[PDB]
Amino acid sequence: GDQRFGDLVFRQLAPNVWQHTSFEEVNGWGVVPSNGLIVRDGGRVLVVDTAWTDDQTAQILNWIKQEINLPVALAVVTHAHQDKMGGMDALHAAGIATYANALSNQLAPQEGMVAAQHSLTFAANGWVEPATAPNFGPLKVFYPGPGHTSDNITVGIDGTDIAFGGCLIKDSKAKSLGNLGDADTEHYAASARAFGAAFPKASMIVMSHSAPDSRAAITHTARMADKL
Ligand SMILES: [Zn+2]
Ligand SMILES: [Zn+2]
């Protein structure tokens, strides 16, 4: 079921999980949807990724205030690209603590993005170091390796059958991995598979530019990456 607030679209995926969608015209691609998540965790709300712009991100915050009416404690952004970090200033103006891979924060200035306030670091097995992600509630953050970008991270939602692949994962019907300009073509397949292995039971795979899919999205993405 889809709900609308301004230029955004919201779809409920689980009793306490919603997908947020914002659009931007991208040369050679079209009017591209970018998806993120909204998670209600007891008396607070957690956000995964911004919208493409500050104005669109402010609309996510206003929709949370209206439909959920619980304060937004934090946001995790999954890499330093406009569709995931374009709205950082809107989060900061609202007093929301922001987190990103330390590498995302390092790359953010070069990418024309505003860095997150806090940096996440990861173990050699890809799992986030818990001292860098305190009070993340059901969010389980995993760095699968370089793929779509060198800094892309993924998030699993504990207590649900959902795992969010961000821009690393394409749906099971995709014909390419899209723009490979910032991609790691040598490690993409292994990174896609590391994401699948980190959340081995998730049956609903959420991704940035397609509607939620089955685990066939992971298998297919990795098969496409094997040809690179
Ligand atoms: Zn990207
Ligand atoms: Zn993307």
What spacing in Å lies between the alpha carbon of 97 and ligand 2's midpoint? 22
What spacing in Å lies between the alpha carbon of 43 and ligand 2's midpoint? 30
Termini Cα distance of the chain = 37
Resolution in A: 1.6
Question: Residue 183 CA: which ligand is closest?
Answer: 1
R_g of the chain, CA atoms, integer Å? 16
User: Is 187 annotated among the ligand-binding residues?
Assistant: no
User: Is 179 annotated among the ligand-binding residues?
Assistant: yes
Residue 228 gets which letter from DSSP?
Answer: -
Technique of determination = X-ray
CATH class assigned to 2-227: alpha beta
Question: 98 and 91 in contact (C-beta within 8 Å)?
Answer: yes
Which tokens is 145 given? 């390796």
- Kindly give the residue spans of alpha helices, DSSP state H, lying in the chain: 54-67, 82-85, 88-93, 102-107, 188-198, 216-226
User: Is 170 annotated among the ligand-binding residues?
Assistant: yes
Q: How many residues does the chain have?
A: 228
User: Is 79 annotated among the ligand-binding residues?
Assistant: yes
What spacing in Å lies between the alpha carbon of 79 and ligand 1's midpoint? 7
Which tokens is 119 given? 């940096």
Backbone angles phi, psi at 106, to 5 degrees: -65, -40
Name the residue ranges covered by the structural domains of the chain. Answer: 2-227
User: Is 118 annotated among the ligand-binding residues?
Assistant: no
Spatial distance between the Cα atoms of 32 and 55, rounded to a whole number of angstroms: 17
Question: Residue 80 CA: which ligand is closest?
Answer: 1
